Design a protein around this ligand. Structure first.
Ligand SMILES: Nc1ncnc2c1ncn2[C@@H]1O[C@H](COP(=O)(O)OP(=O)(O)OP(=O)(O)O)[C@@H](O)[C@H]1O
Ligand SMILES: Nc1ncnc2c1ncn2[C@@H]1O[C@H](COP(=O)(O)OP(=O)(O)OP(=O)(O)O)[C@@H](O)[C@H]1O
Ligand SMILES: Nc1ncnc2c1ncn2[C@@H]1O[C@H](COP(=O)(O)OP(=O)(O)OP(=O)(O)O)[C@@H](O)[C@H]1O
Ligand SMILES: [K+]
Ligand SMILES: [K+]
Ligand SMILES: [K+]
Ligand SMILES: [Mg+2]
Ligand SMILES: [Mg+2]
Ligand SMILES: [Mg+2]
Lengths: 527, 527, 527
């Protein structure tokens, strides 16, 4: 459709590499504990100061349309490493740059770049198998704290709060990072069923100190449909008044007649009653109301599947809770007097629904519901003086959470780039099929030294001598870039998730080996 | 999305500092009692002439996109100091510039800027602890006048007019700065319940001198809903006529039939009656009408929670006031004959609602309601010849009010930048963990002299000699920039709020230490 | 309409060839097993890395409007070869460039380019007849795997799964290439009737493990129109309950009364019943419902042609299936207890409708229906680390599928360009009518060596010496570009489809011989 510019051979490959080396030099400065931080100008407001590889990579676009192709491919590498792993984007960026450079240097007239790519993938599969061979499972919370500390730029107070959250809500539990209005971070553990729905009317308040609505051992009434008529709410009030028990009515809404009855009974005779909207808008609303009915111990009125009417209310069919807190912004239920067998059956139903869904938005909803039935959720509030500090620390806390989850799921290997340095003996025992696959095997063999070299280079010391001292040392001795000496990496706590390393290596290698098969580059003419 | 320009190392850090030094030189000229004033061009009309640090900072944007990043970060420093404290924005600006300069000068190949930042925050926490150690509470109104005088550029009349307002309406009372049409400032104390609602009909006037509607010992009828029918207003008029007491009807509105009845009864037989609209539009109208219900001694008719009907009106159901003044623009109620216990209970309810809200717009409403139930509010009308004078003086009056509130809340330390000069012995007793945290501790140690140096530099004298004479003097002796000698600064009245100093230092240090961790700057290409 | 630029003679033919040689040099680098790969800039997102001839050709447009004509004509050559054959676009591109060059070189004052074109088409018809003479039918699945391996750039793991898919679903069966979320490719064979329609209500689930709705030996009720009334669904439930058989109701939709009846019966008494929407929107919905009626063994109710009512349902009118699985996204029917004679009659009807349609969108629908009634369909999921890998491999899998189908339809000749090299003895036995047709015969004779020369040139060796060794060898000996030696092409497995070769040659030759009749070129003036 538009006029094109076509470039051939090494005149193009030298240009695309110029886009890689420009984008992978702004990322490699953020690697390791001694790496520095990149400021990106934001158009709407204040600049974004970040140490994240995928945030630096995604913000670099080049005016030259031949360098922009290499920039976009390394952006793809970093973005894929962020998507599948959540950490190790800088390592993937520098590995992709190294593979691109080594593959561009090795292209000759008789060379076959496709067989070089095949050798690269064969060597990478061998390295991934060796990484899975040398992994160890996480068995103690000390290793959890060590992983979260290493992944958060050596911040011990972030590892110690993520480890506490995983100890409280479970290792496979819901932990959410949130903005904080204080100077220091904090951890909030939410137990029971708390939903962001307030009371319908402010006259239900019986606690003057916190402006809350609090009862003990309260009856629970639930409904899918809106409650409007007098006859649909009076019999539940008769069960509440006869047994002398408080009532909380969770519904879609309570309309004018039912509201008038509830507030008039609350203010005049002294009946204890509160009305709360139900959380959700669609099928999640139905699922949360059914979860509430299972946890409380009663049946939920007005379901579409089964004919249940609010006109006939029985005492066994109303739920029971030991504690209910309803405020203006949220409502909270604890100690539901349900049956544990049905709660476990609902947990199994949610787990089996989780195992078959892939929408990435339903999964969060069923995880939240499962955590509400389980020990609860955790909220890490990140504190700082300004929004820039909060965003910078929130990036590191999110990276630490993702790396802690990846270490839970798969395992831990040595950190500091020393995991890939012990997979070079695995590459030295490979027999290439032809001379072209040997080139790819040597490319991958020379690439495994790059992360440790970059970590040592950002620390100011010479990367090559440090790496050569690492390989000549024992299998447990590695360089500590913060302290500057050679230590036992497991004992000192420098460990990495296996999933992060084997994701970064593969996602770098595939895209870079596909890039190094290029001869002709077609771009648009700059209008 | 757009083409980017990427800069590396000291070629970028020298540019961003050029945006800091440009922004923090236009602010540092306004520091101290001998500081000068900055004129900013306004596009719509007359230029804005101001001495406020945050107003000068927020008005500076630079065409170079590398200098604009440093400009935006110092803007963030000034804006955060203005939000959290309301004063000390120039001090935060100059502290941020000094920390940025000292951190940029100390970056080498082997240096770790993250550990330098950690040392900076460690030193800042030590200085903040020392500042809280040496603070004194405000115990006399003389110190209140001294704080408001120092914060208003040495204006003794502003300090006196704020000390008098705090003596009249209370230290934690509502004081509002307003435009004045005279040459001199004035203070207006509004007692009782005054709301900006006039009478419905001009025929209710019984005072010819001021065109006001005034009664003594009047009945009060309050209506939630609009009054339209004859039967909803006649029985209240029967209670008013039988007891021979004036009646004021505060409602949403008075419609045609009730209005015709009221004006016809007022003009024909001589019944004393006035109708006023209710202040507010939503829930604030409900809360204000309830406040008048408790304050007057009656119950508000037509409430949604409890069925109250205007058709049956009892003499105990009507409030009583000792004084009512209704004009065209406002209505005024004093000496309500309510019960003091219920008034105190309503005050406690408003206070407990204040302690749990964070919307920053509801807080003003509950503060206004609490002050209406309390001694009252104060209005400082700022006088001047032109609008530029009123705006320039209003900035200083607002700064004095914010600093007086901050001195009430936390305490007072020595002014003139001498509060931070006595925290250098606190820094000299710190043991840094490594060589990189020692750099940050020395950066903060060299930064604590900067406010006193800037104050002395704006006075024309040499800052370094003055600071060295301050540090070699006693703990109470400091420089007086207005008079030019070394005086006992507590006895002379040069004091500062502790909250302002410890806010400016922290908000400068966090953002500037985050800025000094930069190596790569990514900006947009100027199209 | 617009101002035109007119060029005459060799000043124009030298320009248009400059557009051919620019477009056919970016394609010829992708030829053979040692050919390289072209990166094309995409405006919206990541660049497209590809080896396809027609994708490289269609993405090249030139700013010069005289070169763009030759570029557009070679684009037409590649696009026609892609439409008619699906493979061999690079061969057609290089043959078109060679014919254009040889015809442009031979134009003189006395030459007749129209008779040169006539000689070109005469020689091409002779070569096509010789190619059809030397073809062999595909008789073993080993040749199928060899063809799919050669067409997929020597990937044995693609040819193996394509051969397995053709062995499972039949050689003339539906095979669909799809995106994969894994690292490796996979093959999914779908048997029976599977349609992408879920259940109406989630309460029909009776399998907790997979959240599926599964029965065995179930009755099937099929409805053309929507089911809403009570009386239209009750008698079918009576047949289901009396015989104690599960029921699946495939309809347009099930409305509120019927849904309430179905879920209430499913939850209360325990009747096994599921409601599924019908697949399709128009006549395809009718045809699919009729096919399900024939396969299951019942009659579809509510058809427009014949008056069938849901109020009277007989046990013989309901279909029977041995296994039904209904999930949220799809339904599955297997082992329909229909009559084989009517199923074969429906298969014959679908085949006879296929033989008379040419819309290219109905053909896919009847092929899908025929495969659903036949062994089933196959889905090849292409795996990769990133989207670029998946697209690059999907192009080769799509090429291998099309070449395998073309080898099924017509036959196989020698690969590596050795098919056209054995048709030059066929050209040496032609007697030209005049001197101008002899020029075209010699042009085609010199063009038949071009594919083998290009394959040998991309391998780094000299094309002319390799070709001259090929024609001096036996009829079965050809160059293996991957291994670099002269081998028996049939025994080593280097074979090509006859249809692909005879399509590429003809589509190149016609358009290039029409191009070589040019004397005057009229273009638009570049505004
Ligand atoms: N004290 C340390 N000594 C040596 N190596 C360390 C130390 N702390 C961390 N590392 C190593 O530094 C690397 C962490 O680098 P960094 O976190 O900056 O980037 P990343 O994980 O590749 O990507 P992302 O920017 O997405 O976090 C890991 O290889 C880790 O093992
Ligand atoms: N007579 C004085 N002698 C010495 N120092 C003084 C005197 N009066 C005020 N100061 C000091 O000068 C500073 C006041 O500066 P200024 O009010 O211009 O700026 P600020 O408070 O930092 O910010 P803002 O511009 O927002 O008001 C305080 O440190 C105060 O203690
Ligand atoms: N190992 C081999 N040795 C020799 N020739 C080979 C070998 N493998 C394939 N070929 C030949 O290379 C050609 C395949 O080229 P290629 O697949 O790149 O292009 P194409 O089929 O013309 O078009 P498209 O780009 O659409 O796939 C065929 O002529 C095939 O016979
Ligand atoms: K990083
Ligand atoms: K100032
Ligand atoms: K090709
Ligand atoms: Mg990390
Ligand atoms: Mg001030
Ligand atoms: Mg092909």
């Amino acid at each position: 459709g538009s006029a094109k510019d076509v470039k051939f051979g090494a005149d193009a490959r030298a240009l695309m590499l110029q886009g890689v080396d420009l984008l992978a030099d702004a990322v490699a400065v953020t690697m390791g504990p001694k790496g520095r931080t990149v400021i990106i100008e934001q158009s709407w407001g204040s600049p974004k100061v970040t140490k994240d590889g995928v945030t630096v990579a995604k913000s670099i676009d080049l005016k030259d349309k031949y360098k922009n192709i290499g920039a976009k491919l390394v952006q793809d590498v970093a973005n894929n490493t962020n998507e599948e792993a959540g950490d190790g984007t800088t390592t993937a960026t520098v590995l992709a740059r190294s593979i691109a450079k080594e593959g561009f240097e090795k292209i000759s007239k008789g060379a076959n770049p496709v067989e070089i790519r095949r050798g690269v993938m064969l060597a990478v599969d061998a390295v991934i198998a060796e990484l899975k061979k040398q992994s160890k499972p996480v068995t103690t919370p000390e290793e959890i704290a060590q992983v979260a500390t290493i992944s958060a730029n050596g911040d011990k107070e972030i590892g110690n709060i993520i480890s506490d959250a995983m100890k409280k809500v479970g290792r496979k539990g819901v932990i959410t990072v949130k903005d904080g209005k204080t100077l220091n971070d904090e951890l909030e553990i939410i137990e029971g069923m708390k939903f962001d729905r307030g009371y319908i009317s402010p006259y239900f308040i019986n606690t003057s100190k916190g402006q809350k609505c609090e009862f003990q051992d309260a009856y629970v009434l639930l409904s899918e449909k809106k409650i409007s008529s007098i006859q649909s709410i009076v019999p539940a009030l008769e069960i509440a008044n006869a047994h002398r028990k408080p009532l909380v009515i969770i519904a879609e809404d309570v309309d004018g007649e039912a509201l008038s009855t509830l507030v008039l009974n609350r203010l005049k005779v002294g009946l204890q009653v509160v009305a709360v909207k139900a959380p959700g808008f669609g099928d999640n609303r139905k699922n949360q109301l059914k979860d509430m009915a299972i946890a409380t111990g009663g049946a939920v009125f007005g379901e579409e599947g089964l004919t249940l009417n609010l006109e006939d209310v029985q005492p066994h069919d109303l739920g029971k809770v030991g504690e209910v807190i309803v405020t203006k912004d949220d409502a909270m239920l604890l100690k539901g007097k349900g049956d544990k067998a049905q709660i476990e059956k609902r947990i199994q139903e949610i787990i089996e629904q989780l195992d078959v869904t892939t929408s990435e938005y339903e999964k969060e909803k069923l995880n939240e519901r499962l955590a509400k039935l389980s020990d609860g959720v955790a909220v890490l509030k990140v504190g700082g003086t300004s929004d820039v500090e909060v965003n910078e620390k929130k990036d590191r806390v999110t990276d630490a959470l993702n790396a802690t989850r990846a270490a839970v799921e798969e395992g831990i290997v040595l950190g500091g780039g020393c995991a890939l340095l012990r997979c070079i003996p695995a590459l030295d025992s490979l027999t290439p099929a032809n001379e072209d696959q040997k080139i790819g095997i040597e490319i991958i063999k020379r690439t495994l030294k790059i992360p440790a070299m970059t970590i040592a280079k950002n620390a100011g010391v010479e990367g090559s001598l440090i790496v050569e001292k690492i390989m000549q040392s024992s299998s447990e001795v590695g360089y500590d870039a913060m302290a500057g000496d050679f230590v036992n990496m497991v004992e000192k706590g420098i460990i990495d998730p296996t999933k992060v390393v084997r994701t970064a290596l593969l996602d770098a290698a595939g895209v870079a080996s596909l890039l190094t098969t290029a001869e002709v580059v077609v771009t648009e003419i700059p209008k």
